[PDB]
Amino acid sequence: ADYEVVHDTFEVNFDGWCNLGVDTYLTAVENEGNNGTRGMMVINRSSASDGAYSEKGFYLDGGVEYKYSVFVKHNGTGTETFKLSVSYLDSETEEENKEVIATKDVVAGEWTEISAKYKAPKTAVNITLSITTDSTVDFIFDDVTITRKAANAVLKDMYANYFRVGSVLNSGTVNNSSIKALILREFNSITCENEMKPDATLVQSGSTNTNIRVSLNRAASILNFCAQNNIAVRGHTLVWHSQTPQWFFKDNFQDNGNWVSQSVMDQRLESYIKNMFAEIQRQYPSLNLYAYDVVNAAVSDDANRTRYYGGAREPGYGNGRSPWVQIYGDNKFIEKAFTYARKYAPANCKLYYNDYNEYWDHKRDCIASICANLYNKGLLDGVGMQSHINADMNGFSGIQNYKAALQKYINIGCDVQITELDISTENGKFSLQQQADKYKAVFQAAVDINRTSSKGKVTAVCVWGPNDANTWLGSQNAPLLFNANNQPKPAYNAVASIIPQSEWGDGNNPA
Ligand SMILES: O[C@@H]1[C@@H](O)[C@H](O[C@@H]2CO[C@@H](O[C@@H]3CO[C@@H](O)[C@H](O)[C@H]3O)[C@H](O)[C@H]2O)OC[C@H]1O
C-alpha cells in the first residue's frame, strides 16, 4: 500500500454505502463508529448474505491491485466471522464475478480491522465492495480505506455569475475516469439520467399505502460523488407517466392488480414524495439538492388534448399514456404533487415543472398556463425547458420559437432552467458548426435573460449527457458538447466564448 483512493468515514453522509438485502437497514450514528467517531450500523439482517455494499467504480480501476481495509465491530456473543467481498462486471464478457477477498474472526465488542489486497481483471468495471458475516448479527463499520501502490477557462467558472452549468451521470458513466475528470473540470450541476426516477427508487416489498418504501441505492454512488465534490444535484423526477412501475397504481401492489382510487393514490403520492426527501436528507445531508423536477412531461403533444382536455395525456400505461391520468382522470394530480413537494422539500430545493416540445405553441401555452397558476399559488419555482432540440436555427425548435418560449416562461415571474439540452444533428443532416451555432444561440439567449429581465432568471443550463458516446439519442445524432473521445466539439468552444474573462467566477460557488 502507498496511495489512498477511498476513505469512507461516515462523518457526514452515507458515503455511497447501501443495504445489501431488501430489508437490511443502514443507519449512521454519531459516537458509535471507530475511535469515537460516527459509524455505519447495519441492522435487520435476516440471513448471512445481507449486509452492506458500495459501488466504487468512480475510484477503482480493473487491473490495479488495491488494499481494502475496513474496521468492524459487533455486539453479539462470541466470535463472528466477517467477510469482505469484491464484485465487478467484466466489460468484455458482460459477466459478473464476485469473490470473498478477506475472512476475519472478530470477537464481541472490539474494533477490528479486516483487510486484504485484491486485483480485479483489467476489464473489470463497477468494482463493488461488500461486508457480511457468516450469521445475521448486527454490526457497525467505519474507516473503509482503499489504497494503491479566480478562475479557469471551464464552463462552471465562465458562467459562475449567470447560472449553474450541468450534465448527467448514470450507472455506466460513473466508471469512466475521463468522464469523471470532465465533470470535475466543467460542470457544477448533475442530474441522474435514470437513477432517481420512480422505477429506480420505489421499493415494492413491504410498501403500504401510507408508507411507500424508497431506496437511494441506484443513485448512491452519484449522490456521494457530487456531495464530496461540491456539485449540486437536480432531482429527477417525482411524477412521470414513464419509468414508473405499474404496481405503484394498483390496489395489491402488483402490476396486474386493480387501479387504485384517487384517495389511495394521494396517500401513495404523498408518502413517496415525503420519503424521497427524507432519505436524501438522512443519507446525503451535505448534498446541495438545489432543484427537483416534481412533475415531468404531463402536458400532451396532441393539440386536441391541450385544447379540450386541459393538456392531459390519454389515460393508461405505455405508448405515452398516463397512469396518473388513469387514476385522477385529469391533470389535477399536478397541483397535488407540488403541494406535497412544497411540504417536504428542503427550503433551498427549487421546485420545477419540466417538459419537452416546450416551444411548440399549443403545448407551450398549456405549460405556461399550468406553471403560472402553480407559481401564483406559491407551489412552483420554475419551468424546466428540457430543450430536446435539433441543430436548425429555423423551424420547430428554431431560435425564434425557443426564445419566445424562454421569454414567456420568464415573464411568469418564476425562474427557468434549461434542463436536458441536447442538439441533434438528425443523423448527419446538420453540420457541427450548425450545431455550434444552436448551442451558442441557446446559451446566449439565457445570458440575455439574466442581463435583462430580471425578476425571473435562468438559474441552470444543463446538457443531457457528458459526451456523444453517452446520449439517449444515439451517437449518430452527435448531440452534445464533447465527442465520443471526450474531446471538445465546435459547440464547446462556441459556448466557451460567450462570457468575457473579466466576468468569470468560482464555479464551485456560483451566484
Ligand atoms: O429501456 C429503458 C430506456 O428506454 C431508458 O432510456 C432512458 C429514457 O429516459 C431518458 O431521459 C428522458 C428524456 O425525455 C425526457 O422527457 C425525460 O425528462 C427524461 O427523463 C434517458 O436519457 C434514457 O436513458 O433507460 C432505462 C431502460 O430500461
UniProtKB/Swiss-Prot annotation:
Active site: 297, 420
Organism: Acetivibrio thermocellus (Hungateiclostridium thermocellum)
Similarity field: Belongs to the glycosyl hydrolase 10 (cellulase F) family.
Residue ranges of domain GH10 in the record: 150-498
Part of the intact protein present: 32 to 551 of 1077
Domain CBM-cenC: 2-149
Listed name of the protein: Endo-1,4-beta-xylanase Y
